[PDB]
Amino acid sequence: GAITYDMEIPSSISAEKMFKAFVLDGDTIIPKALPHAITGVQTLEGDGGVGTIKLTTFGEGSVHKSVKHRIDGLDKENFTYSYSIIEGGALDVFESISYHIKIVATPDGGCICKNRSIYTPKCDAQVSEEEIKAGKERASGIFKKVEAYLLANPDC
Numbered sequence: 187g188a189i190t191y192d193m194e195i196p197s198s199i200s201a202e203k204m205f206k207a208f209v210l211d212g213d214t215i216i217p218k219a220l221p222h223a224i225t226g227v228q229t230l231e232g233d234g235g236v237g238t239i240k241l242t243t244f245g246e247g248s249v250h251k252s253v254k255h256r257i258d259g260l261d262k263e264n265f266t267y268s269y270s271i272i273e274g275g276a277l278d279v280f281e282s283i284s285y286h287i288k289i290v291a292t293p294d295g296g297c298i299c300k301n302r303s304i305y306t307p308k309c310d311a312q313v314s315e316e317e318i319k320a321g322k323e324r325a326s327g328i329f330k331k332v333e334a335y336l337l338a339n340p341d342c
Contacts (some may be wrong), residue, residue, distance in 0.1 A: 187306075188282070188284075188304050188305065188306040188307075189304070189305050189307075189313050190302055190303065190304045190305070191302065191303055191313075191318045191321065192300060192301065192302040192303075193300070193301050193302070193321075193322055193325060193326075194298065194299070194300045194301075195298075195299040195300070195301065195325075195326070195329050196296065196297075196298060196299075197289075197296060197297045197298075197299045197329060197333060198295065198296040198297070198333065199296075199297070199332070199333050199336050200297070201262070201265040201289035201290070201291065201297050201299070202262065202265070203336060204265075204289060204297065204299060204329075204332065205260070205265065205267050205287060205289070206234075207332035207333075207335055207336060208287070208328050208329070208332055209240065209257065209269060210233065210234050210238075210257070211335075211342075212227045212240070212328070213227050213228060213229070214227075214335075215328065215331050215332055215335055216242065216328060218331050219324065219327035219328040219330070219331040219332075220323075220324050220327050220328075222245065222246060222247060223244055223245055223246065223247050223248050223320070224242065224243070224244055224245065224324075225243050225244060225245040226241070226242070226243040227240065227241065227242050227243070228240070228241040228243075229241075230254065234257075235257065236257060236258065236259055236260060237256065237257070237258075238256060238257040239254060239255075239256050239272070240254065240255050240256065240257065240269075241253075241254055242254075242255065249275060249276075249278075249279075250274060250275020250276060250278065251275065252274050252275065253271055253273075253274035253275060253276045253277075254271070254272055254273045254274050255269055255270055255271045255272060255285075256269065256270055256272055257269055258270045258284070264288065264289075264290055265287070265288065265289035265290065265297075266286065266287065266288045266289075267286070267287040267288075267289075268284065268285070268286060269284070269285045269287075270282070270283070270284040270285065271283040271284065279307075279308070279311050280305055280306055280307055280308065280311060281306045281307060281308050281309075282304075282306040283303070283304065283305055283306070284303070284304040284306075285301070285302065285303050285304065286301070286302040286303075286304065287299065287300065287301050287302075288300040288301075299329065301325050301329075303317075303321050305317075
């Protein structure tokens with residue numbers, strides 16, 4: 187089938203600005219969030235919206251130098267965001283890789299932000315604990331460097 191793993195994050199930035207900083211503005215913030223194994227991020231479409239394609243590229247300790255993914259869906263009623271890997275070396279081991287954020291407000295001027303990944307094998311791979319734990323540290327780094335970017339620069 188397809189296997190999946192999740193994490194939940196308390197945040198104070200607005201749910202739109204959170205995902206905007208997380209991948210749309212991710213051109214600097216994702217490199218700064220994972221400065222060892224990531225080296226760069228770039229857009230490959232009319233940006234920001236659904237059906238935007240995005241490059242992400244990698245450094246030391248890395249199985250593949252690059253991957254491409256899409257901004258796949260967004261639902262600002264309960265701010266769910268889909269984003270999915272479409273080509274590049276992550277799909278050498280896997281048939282498809284995908285991701286799911288969910289964001290809802292609090293009574294305290296913030297948000298609760300859940301994040302998740304989905305891995306579809308070529309009917310063989312088990313999914314490695316390495317990307318479960320690195321996925322936590324990488325997504326955490328983004329949710330921290332995004333709030334620190336918007337601490338310095340909320341006017342964007």
